[PDB]
RNA sequence: GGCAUUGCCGCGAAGCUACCAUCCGCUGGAUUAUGGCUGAACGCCUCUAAGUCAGAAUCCAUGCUAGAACGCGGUGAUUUC
């Protein structure tokens, strides 16, 4: 319906500095700093108060404004990332063959491999994206933990792991066997 | 020794040749379907809309064959009369 002006706020908490050129959006926080190439969606910032940017479209269309909001999700999700952190919890699940989940180093690269998977003789490897810890969690049995400031990386990293688990030529409803994504949530708790 | 239109028979080197013999037949990327991440649209959700991950005997490369006879480069010597 070409909307003249549609904008959202971005919210900057006050130990992150938020450096915008032209779509290259550099947030800095406690926990590092994040870099987004936002070039593709053409956009307006605007710093407010120097704990707002405001972010908008003018004359523009129902996907550029859906876009918008995308963009802010994401900027908001950096500074989430930069102050909070991302932590995804996954939980190896099997029936029969038990999951042997290690970190293992190949030419200094910190794979996670998967070993007797459904009772494979086949080991997976996945790599570690850079800025992605992985931790195996004590007191909760068959717990890995991923995290990070880069939300895209830490899903991706365990988007990863889930999938190099997927049973083939089985029934998934019966051979539920793999390593699921349990939790998302942020590495600082209760903030 | 000749002839029998290579007279016939056995063996027969060389050459040619047979899954009737032996050897050899490569690894990278991008993808389809599909399964996902982030994420609005549509306070939720959503693999999709922006962006993005993996992925087929597929495709393009690597590799192999020919080398444009009007595509090109480097290099040697260039007629004592
Ligand atoms: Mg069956
Ligand atoms: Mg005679
Ligand atoms: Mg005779
Ligand atoms: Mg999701
Ligand atoms: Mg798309
Ligand atoms: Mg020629």
Same mark, same amino acid.
């Not at 990332?81 to 910190?110: C, L, Q, S, W």
């Not at 998977?117 to 086949?122: E, I, N, R, T």
């Not at 995290?147 to 889930?162: I, K, T």
């Given at each position: 319906?070409?909307?003249?002006?549609?904008?959202?706020?971005?919210?900057?908490?006050?130990?992150?500095?938020?450096?915008?050129?032209?779509?290259?959006?550099?947030?800095?926080?406690?926990?590092?700093?994040?870099?987004?190439?936002?070039?593709?969606?053409?956009?307006?910032?605007?710093?407010?108060?120097?704990?707002?940017?405001?972010?908008?479209?003018?004359?523009?269309?129902?996907?550029?404004?859906?876009?918008?909001?995308?963009?802010?999700?994401? =900027?908001?999700?950096?500074?989430?990332?930069?102050?909070?952190?991302?932590?995804?919890?996954?939980?190896?699940?099997?029936?029969?063959?038990?999951?042997?989940?290690?970190?293992?180093?190949?030419?200094?690269?910190?794979?996670?491999?998967?070993?007797?998977?459904?009772?494979?003789?086949?080991?997976?490897?996945?790599?570690?994206?850079?800025?992605?810890?992985?931790?195996?969690?004590?007191?909760?049995?068959?717990?890995?933990?991923?995290?990070?400031?880069?939300?895209?990386?830490?899903?991706?990293?365990?988007?990863?792991?889930?999938?190099?688990?997927?049973?083939?030529?089985?029934?998934?409803?019966?051979?539920?066997?793999?390593?699921? =994504?349990?939790?998302?949530?942020?590495?600082?708790?209760?903030?």
């Amino acid at each position: 319906m070409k909307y003249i002006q549609t904008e959202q706020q971005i919210e900057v908490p006050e130990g992150v500095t938020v450096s915008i050129k032209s779509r290259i959006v550099k947030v800095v926080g406690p926990r590092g700093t994040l870099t987004k190439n936002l070039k593709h969606i053409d956009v307006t910032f605007t710093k407010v108060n120097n704990q707002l940017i405001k972010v908008a479209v003018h004359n523009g269309g129902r996907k550029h404004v859906a876009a918008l909001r995308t963009v802010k999700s994401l =900027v908001d999700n950096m500074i989430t990332g930069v102050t909070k952190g991302y932590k995804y919890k996954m939980r190896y699940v099997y029936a029969h063959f038990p999951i042997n989940v290690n970190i293992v180093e190949k030419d200094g690269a910190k794979f996670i491999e998967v070993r007797n998977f459904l009772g494979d003789k086949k080991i997976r490897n996945v790599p570690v994206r850079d800025g992605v810890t992985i931790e195996f969690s004590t007191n909760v049995k068959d717990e890995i933990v991923l995290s990070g400031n880069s939300v895209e990386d830490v899903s991706q990293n365990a988007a990863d792991l889930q999938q190099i688990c997927r049973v083939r030529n089985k029934d998934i409803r019966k051979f539920l066997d793999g390593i699921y =994504v349990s939790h998302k949530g942020f590495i600082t708790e209760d903030l």
